[PDB]
Amino acid sequence: MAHHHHHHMSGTVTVTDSTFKTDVLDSDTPVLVDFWADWCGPCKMVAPVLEEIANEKSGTLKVAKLDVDANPEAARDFQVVSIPTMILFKGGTPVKRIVGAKGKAALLREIEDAL
């Protein structure tokens, strides 16, 4: 029976729903979740633009993603009409929400401006 693992070390990782309340909820940090495709089309465009905000933000936060194609129920559950959707959580709660495939600048404004 192996308990310890070497997966947590991995930076960007998708957090399951059952583990969400164990990771997000538990942790008291701003969880950046993105509800888009399986990561290929849009992710390729929102790859750098997203990394920028993270690089400037800090190196502690966590970036979670989910493939809508596989988890379509989760989309509608959180009102998701567009593919490039994102929700800025904080302590297991949707404090902010941003949607749209734009540059780091704009994407960054959608947050602060929304705050």
User: For residue 97, how many other CB atoms are within 10 A of its CB?
Assistant: 16
Contact (CB, 8 A) for 70 and 39: no
Find the domain containing 51 and state its range.
1-115
* Cα→Cα distances 58→45, 61, 83, 98, Å: 21, 7, 26, 19
Q: What is the DSSP letter of 86?
A: E
Q: Which is the catalytic residue, given 43, 68, 99, 107?
A: 43
Sheet of strand 94-99, all strands in order from the earlier edge strand to the far edge: 62-67, 31-36, 85-89, 94-99
CATH number for the domain including 95? 3.40.30.10
DSSP secondary structure of 19-84: HHIIIIITS-S-EEEEEESSSSSHHHHTTHHHHHHHHHH-SS-EEEEEETTT-HHHHHHT---SSS
Number of domains in the chain: 1
In the chain, the amino acid numbered 34 is: D
Torsion on CA atoms 37, 112, 48, 26, rounded to nearest 10 = -60
CB within 8 Å of 33: residues ≥ 6 apart: 15, 64, 65, 66, 86, 87, 88, 89
Catalytic site includes residue 40: yes
Contact (CB, 8 A) for 86 and 74: no
Q: Which is the catalytic residue, given 13, 40, 70, 105?
A: 40
Q: How far apart are CA 18 and CA 96, in angstroms?
A: 22
* Pairing verdict, β 62-67 and 94-99: unpaired
